[PDB]
């Protein structure tokens, strides 16, 4: 019926998104035991598996997401889950230049990222994305908007006749999130020209996040066949949805 998402104001949108934020989880990392290819990926897969549970329940609290059918909710999370993990990782790592904060007790630099084959190129991309957020001085109100955009947008162009009315609802919520980002930038004293530019810069980053997700997904699939890293049953189902 009357969607709650379309009725929310800009400040009410931020409030709902801020309240729905998942927690920052800790890893089972032990600084006594040094790293390796098998041990580090095991820590990361264990961490991402527990984050996925919080992400699924966070998506339910995203305005407009419950209005979608169960089948569409499954598809959006299947296609966007690694993107949402990565932008959260990049967001956690803003205040730690040259390092990636997978957890408050797991802070890794690019020197330690070489312990996994092929992990270096994407480690630097995540670092450059975090550096991009830093020199933009990205705000938490802007971050929760970008993260909700990823959930709704990344799988919207891969869904017939009646289901087309569901695409129009997603694009309506997306347009309201755009209104929210503009409302935030206007409150910070940015001119109309500066609001358009910053809005463009933020959304262009989502192209790189999609790229990092594509590369990361291909690395996780090969690691699945390598058998050296045990993947959880949830991550295996999310991984099969991409290949």
């Amino acid at each position: 019926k009357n969607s709650l998402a379309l009725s929310l104001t800009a400040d009410q949108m931020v409030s709902a998104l801020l309240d729905a934020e998942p927690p920052i989880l800790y890893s089972e990392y032990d600084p006594t035991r040094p790293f390796s290819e098998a041990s580090m990926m095991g820590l990361l897969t264990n961490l991402a598996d527990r984050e996925l549970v919080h992400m699924i329940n966070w998506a339910k609290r995203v305005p407009g997401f419950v209005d979608l059918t169960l089948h569409d909710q499954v598809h959006l999370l299947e296609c966007a889950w690694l993107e949402i993990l990565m932008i959260g990782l990049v967001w956690r790592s803003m205040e730690h230049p040259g390092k990636l904060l997978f957890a408050p007790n797991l802070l890794l630099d690019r020197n330690q990222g070489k312990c996994v084959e092929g992990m270096v190129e994407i480690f630097d991309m995540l670092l450059a994305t975090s550096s991009r957020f830093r020199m933009m001085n990205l705000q938490g109100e802007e971050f929760v908007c970008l993260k909700s955009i990823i959930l709704l947008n990344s799988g919207v162009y891969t869904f017939t006749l009646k289901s087309l009315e569901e695409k129009d609802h997603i694009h309506r919520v997306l347009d309201k999130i755009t209104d929210t980002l503009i409302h935030l930038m206007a409150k910070a004293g940015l001119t109309l020209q500066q609001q358009h530019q910053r809005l463009a810069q933020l959304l262009l980053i989502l192209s790189h996040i999609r790229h990092m997700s594509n590369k990361g997904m291909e690395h996780l699939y090969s690691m699945k066949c390598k058998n050296v890293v045990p993947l959880s049953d949830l991550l295996l189902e999310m991984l099969d949805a991409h290949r």
Binding site: I56, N57, K60, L70, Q73, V74, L77, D233, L234, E237
Partner: peptide, 10 residues
């Protein structure tokens, strides 16, 4: 699917 159950769990 595990994603089905976790979404359904209310």
């Amino acid at each position: 699917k595990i994603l089905h159950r976790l979404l359904q769990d209310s």
